[PDB]
Amino acid sequence: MVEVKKHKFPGVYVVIDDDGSEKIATKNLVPGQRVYGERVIKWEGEEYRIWNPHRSKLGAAIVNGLKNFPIKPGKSVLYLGIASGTTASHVSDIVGWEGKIYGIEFSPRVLRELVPIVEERRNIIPILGDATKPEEYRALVTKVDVIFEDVAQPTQAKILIDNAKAYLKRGGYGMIAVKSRSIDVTKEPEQVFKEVERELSEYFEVIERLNLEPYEKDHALFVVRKP
Amino acid sequence: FISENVRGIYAFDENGNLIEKRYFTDKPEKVLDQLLKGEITKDLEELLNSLKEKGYDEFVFEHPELSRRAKELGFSATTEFPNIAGERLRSNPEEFLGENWFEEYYKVGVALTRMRIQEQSGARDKMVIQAIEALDDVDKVINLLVARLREWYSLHFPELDELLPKHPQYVAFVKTVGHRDNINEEVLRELGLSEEKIKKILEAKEKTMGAWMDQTDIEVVRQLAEEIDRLYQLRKKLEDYIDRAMDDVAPNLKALVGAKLAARLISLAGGLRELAMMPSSTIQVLGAEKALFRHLRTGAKPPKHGVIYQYPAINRSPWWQRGKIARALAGKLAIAARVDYFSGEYIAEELKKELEARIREIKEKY
Amino acid sequence: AMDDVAPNLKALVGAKLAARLISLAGGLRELAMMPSSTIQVLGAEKALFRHLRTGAKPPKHGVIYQYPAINRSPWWQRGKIARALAGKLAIAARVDYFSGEYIAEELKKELEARIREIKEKY
Amino acid sequence: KPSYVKFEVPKELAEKALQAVEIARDTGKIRKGTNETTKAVERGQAKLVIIAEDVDPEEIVAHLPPLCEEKEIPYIYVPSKKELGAAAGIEVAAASVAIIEPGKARDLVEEIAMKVKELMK
Amino acid sequence: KPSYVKFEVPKELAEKALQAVEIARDTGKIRKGTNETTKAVERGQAKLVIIAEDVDPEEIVAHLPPLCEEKEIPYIYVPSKKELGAAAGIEVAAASVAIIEPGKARDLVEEIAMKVKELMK
RNA sequence: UCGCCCAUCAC
RNA sequence: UCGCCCAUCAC
C-alpha cells in the first residue's frame, strides 16, 4: 500500500501511502534508531524515516517549492542553529558516510541532548559557541561546500557573512532562514528582505528567494552562491 | 603567521611554507578551549618563543583577543584570520592529518561540547559512591535478565547456551537476530565472531532440537535482549561519569568563607593543625589583636569578634545581629577547619546551608 | 611583594561562584563585555524563560542569588543588593580580563558601603 | 591617560561630539551611563558612542572600543566624565553616552562617523 | 564506623565513664559540648574526656585522639550523643564531655585510666 | 504580546 | 480536568 520513491533532489526521498499524498523522507544513516519519535518504514534491505514539515521550516520550504537545494551525498557543510538536531538527523541521512557535517549552537543546554546521538550519527560534529563569532571555534572546523543558518538571531546576516568569509570555498553555497521580526519589527517584511538581499548581493550571488506562505507567515528562505 | 587545530600548532611564513609545528602537552579540548576563547597556553607560548629565537619579530594570529594577550606578553602582534597557516590547514586537512582527518576533528569537537558548561557539586564523592553501588547493582540485574534470556531463548535454539558463554555476545546476538533463520555468516562476522565459532552455530541451525516460537512471540525475547543492551550502555555511562567526576575535588574553607578569611585564621592560629585544634569561642576572636591582649592584661571588655569582622553579615548590619552571627560563624568554621585538616573530604555546601539557616533564624528572631 | 598575583572575582564573590558565573556568560570575555542588567540574571533557569516566552515579571537575580549577602538575606534588600552586586561584578571581571591588576578589597568596601546605606535607608 | 584609546586626537572631533550630545538629548533618542551604553552597544542599536578620558578605575569602559569593532559601529572619547554627565543633562557623572537616533543632528553625527572612519584605519 | 574509635570497647568501663559524667555533674568541675571540651582539653589539667560513638560528621571529634596523644590524657566513648547530653543533664545532645575535677568520680577515673592504658598497648 | 529551534507524550 | 488575580505574611 505504501511506496518509497526518490525525490527531484540527490539523497532526498518521498513516501506515498494510504491517503496517497507525498511526504518527505530520508534513507536512514543508522537503521533502527529513533530521534524525535518519527514515522518510519522498514523496506527491502533498507529503512526510511519521515521529516514532519511542521517541525522545521526547511521541510516546509521543500514541500512549498524550494528548487536550488545544495546539500547532497558526500558534500561538506557547516550549519548554525541546530539545538538537539532534528534537522541535522535528516541531512546526516542525505549526506551519508562520504560527507562532513558541523553543527554550531549558542544556547548551551539544548545542544547537550545531541551528544550521545552523534555516537551513532558520526558524520555530525556538535559545537558550542556564538554563531556571530567564527573565531570561537576556528580550530575544530574546516573549509566547506555549503553553509546553513537557522539560529536566526538579530545578528543573522553577520552570522552567515562572517562564517562565509572564514569557511565557504570559492564557488560554494549558502542558505539562510530570514526571521524578519527579529531583524527589524518597525517595518513591513519586504523592506527587511530587501536589505538582506542588497547586503548579501555585495558578497554572494543570490540564486533563489522564497516566502514560506501559504504554509507559514513573515519568515523567508534565501539561497545563495559565493563566486 | 601562526594557526592551531584539533591535533597541534603550526607556523607558516608570509610566502606560505612551514617553519615549525607542535602538538599539545595536555588533553586537546582542555587546551583548545583557552586558544579558541582568546587566551594563551604553554604549547603555543613555546612555539612563539621558538619563532623569537629563530629571529621573527612581527606576529599575525587568527583570534583578536589572543592577539591582544600576545602584545601584552611583549610581542609585535596583530590579527588576520585568512592567513596562510590557517587557510592551508583548513583547506587541505588531508595533507596534514591524512584521509581519516574528520575522525580526530569529531573526537575533540564532541569533547569540547561536553566541556563548555560548568561542573560544581556539593557531594561529588558521595555521588561517585552511589555510581559505584549502581555499577555492582547494574551488573547484578544484567546477570538476572541474562539468566531469563538464556532459559527463554533455549526454547527456540537450545544448542546456543553452551556455545556462546560470553554474556554481552549472547545479548547482542539475540538483539540483532531475533528469529533463528536471520542467522548468516555476514551478521556473525559483523558481530565480530571468529571463523571457528562461525564453523559452529550455522552447523547447529541446520539440525536444532528446539521448539517453535512464532514471529509474534520471538520479538518479545528480542526486546528483552535490546533492553539488556540498554543496561550495558548505562553501565558504560556510570564508568565514564566517575572518570570525569574524579577531577572536581576542593577544600571546604575556600567555599564557606574564602581566602581573605581562611588564610588569616590559619596564620593567626600559626597553622592549619592548630586552627583545627582550636574551639569556636577562640576562632571567634583570632586576629582581635589589641582587643584580646588587653582583655587579658588589664581585664578589659571581652572581644566580640576578631578577623571574622569583614564577613558578609557582620561589618554591614545592625548591632543586634553583629554579636549573634560572630559565634555562630565561629562554630561552623571550627567544624570546617577540622574537616579540611583531618579528612580533606568536601561537604561545604551543607556547611553553607546551615549558616544560611541559622542567619535566617537570626532574621525571624531579630 | 613585587612577585604577588591574585584574581579579583576570586576575592569579590569567592572562587567557586566566580568560576560558575564565568560559564553562564559563555566565557570571562563575555562577563567582561556584557552589561550589569544581563549579568544580574545569568542562569536564572525557568524564571528567565517565563519572563521572555510567557511575558511574566523579570527575575530579580540569577546565579548571583548564591552570593553570601543575598542567599540568607531578607526581601527588602535582596533586589537592591543584586543590582549593585551585578555592577561591581561587571567591574571585577573587566579588571581580571583587561588589566590583570588587583583591587578586590576596594570593590568589596564600596559594595559594603552600599549595603550599610541600604540598612540606613530601609 | 587610559589604556583603551586606539588613536590620538586634539580637541578636534571631541568638542563636536560633546556638542552633538547637547542637541541629540532633546531632539532625538539617547541613553547615559555605561551599562545602558553597553545594552545599546551589545544589541547594536547605538549609532555613535562617547566615552570619558578620566574613568577611575579605568577598566569599567575598557570593553567599549573592541566591542565596537566586533559589531562595526564608530566610537569617540571626551576629556571629563562629570562634564559628559552634565552634557547628558544629569547632575552626577557618566563614564559613557550612547546615541540611538540623532534627531536634528544627522549631518553632524554623519560628519563624526565619516571622520572617525579616517582614524579606525 | 568512624576513624576516631581506634580501640574496640568491651561491655565494661563504657557505663563507668557514663556514671563518671553523672556523678561529676554536681560534685566535680566539668564541661560539655566539643568546643568547650576542646578548650578544657588544651588548657589546665583535664583528668578524663568522653566522646559519643555516633558523631556525624566524624571530623568534628576526630581531632580529640591526636590531641590526647600530645598531652598524656586518656579518652573513652559511649554509644550515643543524645544519651551523652542526657548524662551531662541537658535535653539536647553532646558530641563530647570533659572532666576538670572528678568530684565523686575520682576512683572511677583512676580505674578507667589504669585499664585503658594497658588495653591500647 | 509575539517569533524560531528542540525533546517528550499523545491524537 | 486545568489556569489567574487583590490584600496580608516570610527568606
UniProtKB/Swiss-Prot annotation, chain A:
Disulfide links within the chain: none
Keyword rRNA processing included in the entry's annotation: yes
EC numbers on record: 2.1.1.-
Any Gene Ontology biological process: box C/D sno(s)RNA 3'-end processing
InterPro entries linked to this entry: Fibrillarin, Fibrillarin_CS, SAM-dependent_MTases_sf
GO MF entry, a single one: histone H2AQ104 methyltransferase activity
Keyword Calcium: no
Enzymatic class: transferase
Subunit-level organization: Interacts with nop5. Component of box C/D small ribonucleoprotein (sRNP) particles that contain rpl7ae, FlpA and nop5, plus a guide RNA. These sRNP particles form homodimers, giving rise to an asymmetric holoenzyme.
Stated role: Involved in pre-rRNA and tRNA processing. Utilizes the methyl donor S-adenosyl-L-methionine to catalyze the site-specific 2'-hydroxyl methylation of ribose moieties in rRNA and tRNA. Site specificity is provided by a guide RNA that base pairs with the substrate. Methylation occurs at a characteristic distance from the sequence involved in base pairing with the guide RNA.
Family statement: Belongs to the methyltransferase superfamily. Fibrillarin family.
Protein name, entry field: Fibrillarin-like rRNA/tRNA 2'-O-methyltransferase
Naturally occurring in which organism (per UniProt): Pyrococcus furiosus (strain ATCC 43587 / DSM 3638 / JCM 8422 / Vc1)
Swiss-Prot record, chains D, E:
Localisation: Cytoplasm
Keywords annotated in UniProt: Cytoplasm, Ribonucleoprotein, Ribosomal protein, RNA-binding, rRNA processing, rRNA-binding, tRNA processing
One GO location term (cellular component): ribosome
GO BP term, example: translation
Record carries keyword rRNA processing: yes
GO molecular function, one term: rRNA binding
Signal peptide, first to last residue: none
Annotated InterPro entries: eL8/uL1-like (IPR050257), Ribosomal_eL30-like_sf (IPR029064), Ribosomal_eL8-like_CS (IPR004037), Ribosomal_eL8/eL30/eS12/Gad45 (IPR004038), Ribosomal_eL8/Nhp2 (IPR018492), Ribosomal_eL8_arc (IPR022481)
PROSITE patterns hit by this protein: RIBOSOMAL_L7AE
Pfam families per record: Ribosomal_L7Ae
Summary of subunit composition and partner proteins: May be present in up to 3 copies per 70S ribosome. Part of the 50S ribosomal subunit, where it binds 23S rRNA at its canonical site near the L1 stalk, as well as a possible second 50S binding site near helix 25 and a possible third site on the beak of the 30S subunit. Component of box C/D small ribonucleoprotein (sRNP) particles that contain rpl7ae, FlpA and nop5, plus a guide RNA. These sRNP particles form homodimers, giving rise to an asymmetric holoenzyme. Probably part of the RNase P complex.
Similarity-based family: Belongs to the eukaryotic ribosomal protein eL8 family.
Function: Multifunctional RNA-binding protein that recognizes the K-turn motif in ribosomal RNA, the RNA component of RNase P, box H/ACA, box C/D and box C'/D' sRNAs. Component of the 70S ribosome. Component of a box C/D small ribonucleoprotein (sRNP) particle that is involved in pre-rRNA and tRNA processing. Utilizes the methyl donor S-adenosyl-L-methionine to catalyze the site-specific 2'-hydroxyl methylation of ribose moieties in rRNA and tRNA. Site specificity is provided by a guide RNA that base pairs with the substrate.
Protein name from the UniProt record: Large ribosomal subunit protein eL8
